[PDB]
Write a protein that binds this ligand. Structure first.
Ligand SMILES: Nc1ncnc2c1ncn2[C@@H]1O[C@H](COP(=O)(O)OP(=O)(O)NP(=O)(O)O)[C@@H](O)[C@H]1O
Ligand SMILES: Nc1ncnc2c1ncn2[C@@H]1O[C@H](COP(=O)(O)OP(=O)(O)NP(=O)(O)O)[C@@H](O)[C@H]1O
Ligand code: SF4
Ligand code: SF4
Ligand SMILES: [Mg+2]
Lengths: 260, 132, 578, 226, 96
RNA sequence: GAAACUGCGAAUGGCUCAUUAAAUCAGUUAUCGUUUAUUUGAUAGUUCCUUUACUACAUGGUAUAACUGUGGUAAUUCUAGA
RNA sequence: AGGAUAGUGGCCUACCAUGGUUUCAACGGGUAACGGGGAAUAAGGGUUCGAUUCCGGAGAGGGAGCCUGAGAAACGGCUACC
């Protein structure tokens, strides 16, 4: 209707922000940013709902406007800034560090990380082309272009990004024998290393994946994003380890064993 | 009054706002309601920061009686409390004083009148004076 | 709840072409009584008033949309803000004291306006047509919640909106408060708080510079109305009210009064005028707010309109809500008092004829009348009245406890017994309530009508009449004036009529004497000449002109200087179409 | 008709209520901009020469510049053009405006002047307005006094006091488009930044050549083995 | 909702021999001539010629109720009061 | 720090469903037939094309609102000159 | 083959060809028809409703045209006619 939509209601926003139906009509529309609208998570949502630091929007703004907190080690003062997958949220509150990584149920958990891990992040290369004056370049899932890459780095691979500098510290190739995370959709927040790839002419390369318990499954390659070598993940994984328990194991562990 | 017994459950320290945030639970048999002012007087026994520096807000009584739940804050210094706490709570605490000005629709009417005048508007008055 | 009624005439409301469906499908026509009377003919469809039940069935299936549907005024125990008891006046809506703009409040006389003003002030509190218990504000707030006044009235409860009103009547304010010292001087200083400069601006722009050294009691009602407004104005307060400010005052001095009222309005303040106006309400108010009903029975206030539009609807009648119809000799005497030189010239005071006076307030028209009756004077010579003298007072705020009927026994009802007082008023607006009921509780035009009777009441021919337009409007004024003229022309009398109103003078007038000179200095009464030249003389000095409203024959004062105004100044004529 | 005269040099101005049609028979059938002699009008304006700038006719409508026809016509009016001001951005409106041909129906001729005659007028000739905002920008300051470009700006600046009563002071104009240390620092920093960018691009492309060289060595020399 | 036209005396069918006391009504909206029965014992003397009455259908959805030929509507309110309230002496009818 | 100039915003929202039957619409692709303000990340050392004097690059010109004052019209967030 | 659009394209021009739809139901007419997500009822299958809190569409009295902006054919912008 005659241009961009600036407002956004509750309900229209995704289920994995854990937005309660009541206590408001509207939701925070994520601002135009690196990540997409539906996949990403606003900073306000990360603060008041998850971490429980702020109560109101006021308080959130008052926290953000005094610098302190920063995504990618950069000021980032806007309220509804889209913090997406695999982002370092550096805070000065008792030297606390946070990595956004997916959970069992496809949400963003409060997963703390070490001060050494805060240095670097990862990124799935979406295209690699020549820019102006024949200079090749890559582009990650979060738009962080890197000039003068290694010729080994082709499409669908992962890059380790240094944050402090826009550089390629490492790269990992796309095949079996590597630890392989999976985002997007039904099998969102799982790990199973790849068994084998499938070509399919005319788009959509369904990859076959096999977790630690050998409960194999298939997902689409656009939502697949690797991580590291077998038994050597370059990022510290959360509780659950990208396995996904059935409802039986849930009723055994999460409402029987854990009780006092 | 009997027992009283303040219990600050679900304690979170908040370095980024310079405060602590917590759930005040109170056991008050043989008295009607809890009273915020009395809790402000007696919360300094555990934390020690006078009264206005601390703050609190947020309560509700349990069904039946004898008990009250609530959600509250404790800021470290007074200045921080002044700058971070919402403006309306300060009035309740007696620190700030809200300028009780005109009605909302009245202000809107004023705004419309100001829209209807171009520039400063003293020129119009002067023109009228020359006219008569 | 209401009386729905049909209305007919239109642009090519064609009965000849249509095959008359109105007649063909009306329920009242098809059960005996002819409500809608029509044929294939040259004229319009005629439809009755009294018969029409309402329905609106003819409206839907008339082939052209000629016939509309209206709703007539009637009480239905709806709303009711206040009554007194029973077989008495009631009122339904008091409303939006809308701020930042002056609020006109118009109606035919004895309709509630004054009572509503009192209610708004919080002096005479409402009762919802019931016999309330000790301070029942709660209940009344609950009744008029869901609306603006909830806020207003609650504020009033804790006096965070201080009250002030200009009273209806003028003679009561000097008599009630017997001050230690008179003049403008000190009594104004005790009243005012605001500032030193604003009061200077007020008294200066009020063009008085007269009554700075003089006691209030001596002052004529006009210079006195002026003081009343001044005392209301300077009083430091939140609310502001002016209950009929522009009565018996000069045409020039009305406009600047209005523009002093205007002074108070802007910065988040509420103002509420009442007025029976010509077209000087153009400047008084921004939001005109008409009231309708029956005099001294029920009154309903319509939601506010724009001034222009509102005045234009008051004339025709129908509105977006309802429909209120609407439409021998004497020598040159030299008279003095203390701070005045009231001279008079010789004249021809002819038999079986009227005589018209005009002038600025303080031109000496009024004391003349007193001296003619009996008060003081003369030091050299006079002419005693041949006929028995008949007198009209201006300062009317009387006190005859008991009832008006008792006071009517001091006159007589059995003279020229054929209508007279009934021809003044009896069928449309009614006099039953006015003939009963106390005079203490009676309102302006009705109280004035009391004095219009005290004139053609005692046996007398030679008549002294100054300011009957006091507390009356276009409805009550014109017919009353016509009746007065019919009286004194038919049965052979002589009357010295004195008006501030233009229509009440010019529709009567023939011989016109003109007062001239500055207030609290001089006064010269010029001889009776033609109606045109005399009126020019009256208005050349005042420096104001009129415009006859072409459709309805109605006066509209000009805006000090203008394109048409200057033509009138250069030509001379201030009255078209005789 | 009323007249409104204004002398541009002194910055004075006054109205004149001029009745009698014979006194104003010269002004009729003339255009805005044309020069008119005041001797034919009367003795007070003898010697003067008047240029007309604008005017208003009856009902307060202005005279648009050189638009012809002595009648009010409905015209589209946009931003940055006379006899209109837009509220909303790019808002064009149709308004009835009169032409520049002077006729009987006029009310105020907005008369200016050209030459001052033998007789001196009452208001205009004597008084002179103090021109309010003195030169703000540096170059305009330098052109007002006539200081070439080596006299310094801080000492030669247009002034105005402010006597309150108790405690007196004297606030001055800010200057724009003026040299300081700060701007020199900024330009220097800009150039430096550009240089650093260039060097960073030079250093970056060099390593690419070495990596490429290594790729050619390891890969292309390995083809000789098979 | 409708006005009226006149009171009737409807000759009922066999075997149910009586007179039913209905009203001819012209409506507001279309303005069609309709016949309508008046419920309860007595209660025809409440309504008069020309009067705002709110009608309801019988129950049967079109056609006769029981023994009344042509009549396919009853009443509900007259002068906006309800016949049921009037029959049972609860509420009062306004004069106009 | 009112006013005004500039820059943004006012195309979001909120409201109603009259038209509209392969049209809207849902799921589902595609743009290797494209525009994309703004965020987000990268990004033009080579313009005095006589870079031999060429005008200042210690950084230069054209106006113009608010404003002071003179008014026009019955009137609208009408506006004229100086 | 051009023009026009940010663009493909009968979208529109000039020339040339005689096609495209259809009783597996075109074309017309009606709809008290905005389309979905849904709601009511429920053995199972169904039947009726969906103006209405979410997505999408359309229109701000009727039509038509346009300025300005990245974005409108905007209507708490403009323009004319009814
Ligand atoms: N206290 C009272 N007791 C009995 N009757 C009253 C009382 N107050 C008012 N009335 C009646 O109510 C009517 C209207 O009152 P009011 O509002 O004063 O008239 P009004 O419309 O202001 N007249 P005016 O100002 O001359 O146009 C009058 O006709 C009185 O007869
Ligand atoms: N003893 C006195 N000393 C001084 N002045 C007096 C005295 N008595 C009366 N006056 C005033 O002298 C004036 C004579 O004017 P007057 O004839 O009353 O004008 P008017 O016809 O009343 N016009 P208006 O005020 O419009 O009614 C009056 O205004 C009186 O107030
Ligand atoms: S009103 Fe309608 S119906 Fe009655 S006459 Fe005029 S046209 Fe024929
Ligand atoms: S309105 Fe009701 S009554 Fe008056 S005419 Fe039309 S139908 Fe007959
Ligand atoms: Mg009254």
């Amino acid at each position: 209707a005659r241009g961009p939509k600036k407002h956004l209601k509750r309900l229209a926003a995704p289920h994995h922000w854990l937005l309660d139906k009541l206590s408001g009509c509207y939701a925070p529309r994520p601002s135009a940013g690196p990540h997409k609208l539906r996949e990403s998570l606003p900073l306000i949502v990360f603060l008041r709902n998850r971490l429980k630091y702020a109560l109101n929007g006021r308080e959130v703004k008052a926290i953000l406007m005094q610098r302190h907190v920063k995504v990618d080690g950069k000021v980032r003062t806007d309220t509804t800034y889209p913090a997406g997958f695999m982002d370092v949220i550096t805070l000065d509150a008792t030297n606390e560090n946070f990595r956004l990584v997916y959970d069992v149920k496809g949400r963003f958990a409060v997963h703390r990380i070490t001060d050494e891990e805060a240095s670097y992040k990862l990124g799935k290369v979406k295209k690699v082309q020549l820019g102006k004056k024949g200079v090749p370049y890559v582009v990650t899932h979060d738009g962080r272009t890197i000039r003068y890459p290694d010729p080994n780095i082709k499409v669908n691979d992962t890059v380790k990004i240094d944050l402090a500098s826009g550089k390629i510290t490492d790269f990992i190739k796309f095949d079996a024998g590597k630890l392989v995370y999976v985002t997007g959709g039904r099998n969102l927040g799982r790990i199973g290393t790849i068994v084998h790839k499938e070509r399919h002419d005319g788009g959509f390369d369904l990859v076959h994946i096999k977790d630690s318990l050998d409960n194999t499954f298939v997902t689409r390659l656009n939502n697949v994003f690797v991580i590291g070598e077998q038994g050597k993940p370059y990022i510290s994984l959360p509780k659950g380890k990208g396995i996904k328990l059935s409802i039986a194991e849930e009723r055994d562990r999460r409402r029987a064993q854990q009780g006092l | 009054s009997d027992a009283v017994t303040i219990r600050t459950r679900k304690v979170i320290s908040n370095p980024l706002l310079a405060r602590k945030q917590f759930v005040v639970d109170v056991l008050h048999p043989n008295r009607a309601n809890v009273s915020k002012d009395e809790l402000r007087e007696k919360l300094a026994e555990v934390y020690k920061a006078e009264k206005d520096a601390v703050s609190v807000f947020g309560f509700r009584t349990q069904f039946g009686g004898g008990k009250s739940v609530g959600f509250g804050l404790v800021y470290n210094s007074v200045a921080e409390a002044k700058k971070f706490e919402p403006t309306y709570r300060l009035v309740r605490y007696g620190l700030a004083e809200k300028v009780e000005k005109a009605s909302r629709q009245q202000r809107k009417q004023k705004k419309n009148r100001d829209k209807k005048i171009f520039g400063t508007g003293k020129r119009l008055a002067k023109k009228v004076a020359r006219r008569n | 709840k209401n009386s729905r009624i049909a209305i007919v005439s239109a642009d090519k409301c064609k009965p000849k072409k249509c095959r008359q469906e109105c007649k063909r499908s009306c329920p009242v026509v098809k059960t005996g009584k002819l409500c809608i009377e029509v044929t294939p003919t040259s004229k319009i469809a005629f439809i009755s008033e009294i018969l029409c039940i309402g329905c609106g069935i003819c409206v839907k299936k008339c082939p052209f949309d000629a016939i509309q549907i209206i709703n007539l005024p009637t009480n239905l125990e709806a709303h009711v803000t206040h009554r007194y008891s029973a077989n008495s006046f009631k009122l339904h809506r008091l409303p939006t004291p809308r701020p930042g703009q002056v609020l006109g409040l118009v109606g035919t006389n004895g309709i509630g306006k004054s009572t509503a003003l009192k209610i708004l002030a919080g002096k005479q509190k409402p009762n919802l047509g019931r016999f309330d218990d000790p301070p029942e504000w709660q209940e009344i707030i609950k009744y008029f919640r869901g609306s603006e006044l909830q806020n207003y009235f609650t504020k009033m409860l804790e006096d965070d909106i201080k009250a002030i009103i200009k009273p209806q009547y003028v003679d009561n304010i000097p008599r009630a408060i017997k001050g230690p010292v008179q003049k403008v001087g000190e009594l104004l200083k005790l009243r005012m708080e605001k500032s030193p400069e604003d009061v200077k601006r007020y008294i200066k722009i009020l063009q008085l510079e007269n009554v700075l050294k003089r006691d209030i009691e001596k002052l004529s009602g006009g210079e006195l109305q002026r003081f009343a407004i001044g005392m209301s104005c300077v009083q430091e307060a939140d609310v502001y009210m002016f209950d009929e400010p522009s009565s018996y005052l000069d045409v020039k001095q009305r406009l600047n009064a209005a523009q002093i009222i205007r002074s108070l309005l802007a910065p988040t303040k509420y103002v509420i005028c009442v007025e029976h106006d010509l077209s000087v309400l153009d400047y008084l108010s921004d939001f005109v707010c008409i009231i309708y009903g029956v005099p001294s029975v029920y009154g309903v206030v319509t939601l506010p309109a724009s001034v222009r539009e509102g005045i234009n609807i008051f004339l025709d009648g129908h509105i977006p809500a309802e429909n209120l119809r609407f439409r021998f000799s004497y020598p040159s005497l030299k008279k003095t008092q203390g701070d005045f030189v009231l001279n008079v010239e010789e004249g021809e005071f002819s038999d079986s004829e009227i005589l018209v006076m005009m002038g600025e307030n303080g031109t000496g028209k009024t004391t003349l009348i007193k001296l003619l009756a009996g008060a003081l004077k003369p030091d050299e010579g006079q002419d005693i009245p041949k006929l028995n003298v008949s007198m009209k007072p201006q300062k009317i705020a009387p006190k005859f406890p008991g009832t008006v009927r008792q006071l009517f026994f001091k006159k007589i009802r059995g003279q020229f017994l054929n209508p007279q007082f009934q021809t003044d008023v009896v069928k449309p607006l009614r006099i039953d309530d006015i003939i009963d009921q106390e005079v203490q509780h009676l309102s302006g035009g009705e109280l004035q009508r009391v004095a219009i009777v005290l004139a053609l009441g005692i046996p007398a021919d030679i008549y002294l009449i100054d300011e009957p337009s006091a507390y009356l409007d276009s409805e009550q004024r014109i017919i009353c004036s016509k009746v007065i003229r019919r009286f004194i022309l038919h049965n052979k009398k002589t009357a010295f009529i004195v008006e501030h109103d233009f229509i009440m003078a010019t529709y009567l007038a023939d011989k016109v004497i003109v007062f001239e000179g500055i207030p609290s200095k001089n006064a010269h009464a010029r001889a009776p000449e033609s109606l045109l030249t005399g009126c020019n003389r009256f208005l050349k000095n005042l420096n104001v002109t009129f415009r006859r409203d072409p459709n309805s024959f109605r006066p509209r004062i000009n805006k000090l200087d203008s394109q048409m105004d200057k033509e009138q100044k250069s030509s001379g004529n201030y009255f078209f179409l005789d | 008709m009323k007249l409104n005269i204004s002398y541009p040099v002194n910055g004075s101005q006054k109205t004149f209520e001029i009745d009698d049609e014979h006194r104003i028979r010269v002004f009729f059938d003339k255009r805005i901009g044309q020069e008119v002699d005041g001797e034919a009008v009367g003795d007070e304006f003898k010697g003067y020469v008047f240029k007309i700038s604008g005017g208003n006719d009856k009902q307060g409508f202005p005279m648009k510049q050189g638009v012809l026809l002595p009648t009010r016509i409905k015209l589209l009016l946009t931003k940055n053009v006379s006899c209109y001001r837009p509220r909303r951005d790019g808002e064009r409106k149709r308004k009835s405006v009169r032409g520049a041909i002077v006729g009987p129906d006029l009310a105020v001729l907005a008369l200016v002047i050209v030459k001052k005659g033998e007789q001196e007028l009452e208001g205009l000739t004597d008084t002179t307005v103090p021109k309010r905002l003195g030169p703000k920008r540096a170059n305009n300051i330098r052109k007002f006094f006539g200081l070439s470009k080596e006299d310094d700006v801080r000492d030669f600046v247009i002034r105005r006091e402010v006597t309150k009563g108790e405690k007196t002071y004297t606030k001055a104009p800010k200057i724009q488009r003026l040299v300081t240390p700060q701007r020199l620092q900024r330009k220097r920093h800009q150039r430096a930044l550009k240089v650093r960018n260039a060097q960073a691009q030079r250093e970056a492309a060099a390593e690419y050549a070495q990596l490429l060289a290594k790729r050619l060595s390891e890969r292309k020399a390995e083809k000789a083995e098979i | 909702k409708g006005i009226v036209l006149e009171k009737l005396g409807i000759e009922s069918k066999q075997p149910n021999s009586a007179i039913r006391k209905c009203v001819r009504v012209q409506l507001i909206k279309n303005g069609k001539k309709v016949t309508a029965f008046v419920p309860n014992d007595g209660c025809l003397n409440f309504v008069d010629e020309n009067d705002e009455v709110l009608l309801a259908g019988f129950g049967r959805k079109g056609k006769a109720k029981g023994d009344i030929p042509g009549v396919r509507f009853k009443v509900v309110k007259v002068s906006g009061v309800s016949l049921l309230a009037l029959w049972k002496e609860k509420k009062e009818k306004p004069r106009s």
